[PDB]
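worker-3 :: picked TRAP dicarboxylate transporter, DctP subunit
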Amino acid sequence: ANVSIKVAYENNPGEPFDEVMHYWKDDLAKRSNGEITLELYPSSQLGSKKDVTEQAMMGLNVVTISDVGFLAEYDPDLGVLYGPFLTDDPAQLFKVYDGPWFKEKSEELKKKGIHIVMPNYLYGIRQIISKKPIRTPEDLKGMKIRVPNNVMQIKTFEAMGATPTPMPLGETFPALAQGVIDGVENPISVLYGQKFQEEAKYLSKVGYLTNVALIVGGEAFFSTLPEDQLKMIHESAYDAGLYSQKLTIEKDNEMIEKMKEAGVEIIDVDRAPFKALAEKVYTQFPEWSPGLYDKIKAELN
Ligand SMILES: C[C@H](O)[C@@H](O)[C@@H](O)[C@H](O)C(=O)O
Ligand SMILES: [Cl-]
Ligand SMILES: [Cl-]
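worker-3 :: tokens ->
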């Protein structure tokens, strides 16, 4: 039987993320002999991440890119895994995603209506592009940095001294052009693909978040599918995640040079003072289970 699945994301056509969605679509199409078809909706065509997630939860045949910081809204302990400067090594992160605590969380989420489809996308390392250079935390004072509607990211930027300004990625460009905000934070490929270099000419390599992304949909939808189809969807999704773990990194030199050609200065910074301020967020979540952060660090190594 033919199954169509809408795939919603904020990234624009040609971004590495969009390329990996094409990989996934082709992989799944081939495994299923054309019976399972992904319909791609880049550039926030289906609206905001939080809204798309709600539609999925009611049973719409849609998935969206997301992360554990968003999912913390539904399962609070997941928030710790989106914390700043957790590690610079993707391999360590993926140990937690592959471990039994994350499995338990993923099963909890199903009962809440949320089905993780792809658990292993390497989104990149999040940097900041801004209208004035950020070399020290002191430079962030007075700056309105856009962040997603993600509690951990909001608290992270507050702890470092900025004024976080949350909004969906699809609204960010005009806010930056108008000076409502004066910076944006994201992996360099996403910053470039969203054209923020037209409005901001300083890129600081704070590297505050080594970023894993998830594809998520609604359990009410996925539980209706036969086992053989679910297997093809999960396997092809995992393949795509593995592809992202090569492509995202491979794209680095190319993206650095494109930024330079657009007149953006790439700034290496002393990361330690940013990290020292950001680390305070780990004691700002009273709803976390006791010992959560310690357990996470123990699993990372
Ligand atoms: C995987 C993440 O949720 C991204 O989709 C999100 O950070 C996005 O790049 C944004 O900046 O809103
Ligand atoms: Cl949102
Ligand atoms: Cl958002």
